[PDB]
Amino acid sequence: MTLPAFKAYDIRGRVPDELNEDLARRIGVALAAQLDQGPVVLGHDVRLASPALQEALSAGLRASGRDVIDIGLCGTEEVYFQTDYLKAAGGVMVTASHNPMDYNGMKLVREQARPISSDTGLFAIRDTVAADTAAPGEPTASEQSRTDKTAYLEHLLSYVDRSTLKPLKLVVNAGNGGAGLIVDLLAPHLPFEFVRVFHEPDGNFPNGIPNPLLPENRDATAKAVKDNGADFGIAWDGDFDRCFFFDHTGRFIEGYYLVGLLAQAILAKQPGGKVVHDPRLTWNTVEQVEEAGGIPVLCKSGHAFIKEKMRSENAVYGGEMSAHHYFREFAYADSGMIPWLLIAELVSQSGRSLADLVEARMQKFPCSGEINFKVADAKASVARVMEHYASLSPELDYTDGISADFGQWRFNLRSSNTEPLLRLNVETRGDAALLETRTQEISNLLRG
Template sequence: MSLKCFKAYDIRGQLDTELNEDIAYRIGRAYGQIYQPKTIAVGCDVRLSSPALKQALIRGLNEAGVDVLDLGLTGTEEVYFAAFHLDVQGGIEVTASHNPMDYNGMKLVRENARPISADTGLKEIQALVESQQFVPSTSTGSCQNYNILPEFIEHLMGYIKDQTIRPLKLVMNAGNGAAGHVIDALEQKFKQLKLPVEFIKIHNEPNGHFPHGIPNPLLVENRESTRQAVLIHQADMGIAWDGDFDRCFLFDEKGQFIEGYYIVGLLAQAFLAKQAGEKIVHDPRLIWNTTDIIDKYQGIAVQSKSGHAFIKEVMREHNAVYGGEMSAHHYFRDFAYCDSGMIPWLLVLTVLTQTQQPLSVLVAQMIAQFPCSGEINFTVQDSQATIQRILQHYRSQEPQIDDTDGISLDFGHWRLNVRASNTEPLLRLNIESRNSPQTRPMQSYVDELSQLITQA
């Protein structure tokens, strides 16, 4: 029987119909049989179904002869951290991140937190889970609880070590997901070090019923509580996380949500201000603001296909200090090239201190210079045929064409990227422009492309 929960980058499915405890047990057996690790770290998010799925997974791993360190309630990046920091040979986080209530899933890594995706082993795990051709193990693994939090906090503090931080007031919105315990621990650490940062915590308690909505700040309706708290408390910045907190989303002191694209530029600046000449990896969807900042701060820009497996591979190949996607995934060399939702806002504190500017001013300069549409999704019958239609329509204008990921067309004063989704029947469009006399208003480009994509 073919299982639908195996995706391009992880495991994700509707409970009972696509993912259940039996499948979780088989995933544990398959991981253990294929990779034969001595020990792996396992954690889970706050979803009501996560603890039972985690126990079934651990049972499968143990029966495959694997010892397990049970990290308890964790975000995905705590499992990543354990996988490269501890003497283990892999890690699995049970999470459905920002998916609806009736979903769950898993994110899997090997030693040193190397990703397991469709191209790097997930298909082999799927095949074994489906066939159930399990070989009896000669030994049974053990399971013991392990608290990774103190070591994780020490690692996070390394990103602002020896940095002066100006007095700041921050709104922290964990969305009742897995981030709350890390926010609490960082708050204590900041107080201990007498850093002048005030934490205003909202929806901080983990609650799998998600009383304030699924933690997904990309949904406009989920941003209001962060925005309101920033305004009420006159905070310098708002930070909101998704369910497993591997992504964070920033709001300026006016409560305005900031596109992830511009955060990539800020983080590139944070690293290059400390060390010019470093390589920064970016995805091809929106690039001009990022490459402009990298040039300005004497770094080297490296383009990669979108998606965590590709970004991590390119970062390793080039020894890049940082990689950023406009989707709010940020990757760090000192974090084993993994994505983190905690490191980005810590680095932004250093930029706010160095520039002595409010966040809205820093971002306004970028937006004015390089406006963008944000990602617009279209449901289409045939993604590739639609992309070809766009290509034919603009061919006479002789744009520079880049096929790193989907198709990017560069017209000099404006640029578009269009690509098919890996997981849904969607076409994803991004448009950016330069502040130049030739440039039309952004909406006119959006209207033009929307008409072209939706025409029969």
Template structure:
């Protein structure tokens, strides 16, 4: 029995060839069918050059397991989430490696109701069945059909805003040659049909799995320049950039400045609480002060969850939260089946800019000044555990609070930090914030990184 190393905590991701290939994808399809016993499963794939063949293999595995398959074609992850619930299917599979390097691909799996399947909710069982590879003979193949849900999906997206509130604005939208382009085209067509005076300037909008302008991953500073340049050249009011499967969106203000996801969480929480006072908002432990302040001021209830989509979705369902946000630019919505979407956030921010008459820069500037943060800093370390322990023992004794909800969070009166090992990459992630003191921010960041990387 061969060990499959492509199975991670939340999804399946691996290097093409040895860790993930068509044979393994077929076995995952068979295992998914055997474990869940679904009647109908929705499949989709991103624009990577290997996604089509891997999707075909996983589809064959499902069909051989007697499962009916609805193939959505080339779509982003959230289109699979949407279709699974909208079509009342028993599960969904998206073939994607999101922002991973060129030689990777992967699969994201959900069950009925678009609920995530992660290590503790079925992924380990699917892995075991795929590794054993002892499937019964094919007795009845499932039925295969192709179907698009694009129109219904875009209608759902636009239900989050009131198009009558939108004013003449120009937006730069960079799809990074990933999967977002066709959705942006469909939204643009709807704007025109509804006489919405918003102009979309599209950058790298055509899907191209060879990624001629680099892997779409705007969280890396080197991948932001094309969006910044276009915002400045066009005199745009806002810039939006997506990762490969567009489950995350990244925002740039009218001056081309990248806005950290952390400040967007507070902004969206406030926007939801204006519409639904008293609602519950989920946040993650990495950066928290701005979110807590805005939720409290807006009369909402802030509830902490571990980072990672399966934890946040579970917590949102448990407490019936209206919105959940991670500083990594994942935003979750109750009315989107508690799933994350990269399309809903920019539409909400667009409406906010129009209804307040303030630019995106003006909307976040008070938060950025009140709680400065250098953004997430990653360190590749030989012994992550020892390094984290070293930092902990140096800072813990004088702290006013220490928490172990997700990695370690240590808090002082005027600054705090969170240190955690990544669930998806071999790195330790540092997040730090202060109460309005950029000098202290730089000083403490430098101290902790020096200790961490000794």
């Protein structure tokens, strides 16, 4: 047995048996040993248990001679921004994301908010913690509280020309996570008319744990949009590093289409830039990026792959279909705030609704949505799919699972690196009927 809470990208488990204040304190001790010189930024989400896990992190860190910058209740992206902006040695965000009520977790970064993942420190942290039986030392460094968000808010606003913004009517749905705080601090500097839904942070989640992808949660933002004649609606996950868009009809916009949209928005800022994208769904992104004068860069999905690739390529923007958007100027980190500011600016400047901006693209490259299969034998199931399609001679690429291009349609089939699952994505060249028959044909094969 190894500590179950240590995953590929972060730490998450049930408190107290998979994650607790003792483990959190040991993690702080262990993280001090893994970072270069400098202070460590700490932050936490709205969960009731999160501050105590932060305080243990801080105690272990300061017992190890690390100055601690407590930035308080915040979104994950604030930890990334402050870690990089303040030139810290690293940062930890205590966040349970959309795990159950009795779960919590941490996301860890080193200098310039570079991810710490299982193969880049996180398992080395785990191994140290698992063998650490030492007595907790006492503090030999200080903790300072740094709640000023001015630098962060100014950074967010710098992505748009505020004189070109229109008084759009925007539904905002923090899901009782933490996004409402940042919306409200931005609001005085924006002309938008906000319709606030599930706005107050409440770690008891009276309206459900924040997760806009679940249909009942999706419909609350949809309803608010349609009922209020909003221009569009934005919903966030709890630590708001993910945002989700609803057009003026209340229709949720599948994340695939936000990648090409945001890339076109950004490439009008940065001519000729590179855009990193994942291989699950591609054709639209590639065409929208080239059409906007940029260069698309294919990259294995997963935030740490995306971020490393953006760095090596100097890519201005990176987008994943699963509602993750990374920005070079934002320390190559993801933000749940930059994207909607960019979209609001695009609608304001173009005179086009969010619906119109994506409508033709969704018709031209219709996609299945990511479809998950839990199966008895992932390898055997994947082979059953590949054998069935072999006689059609698809063009195959193994960048991230299997990508098979048949000409008028393609799919990607992946093993998740964060769950024991197979994940299917299918798209076609403007053919809804071929999309359905091929999705069902593949689905039946995987379920075989």
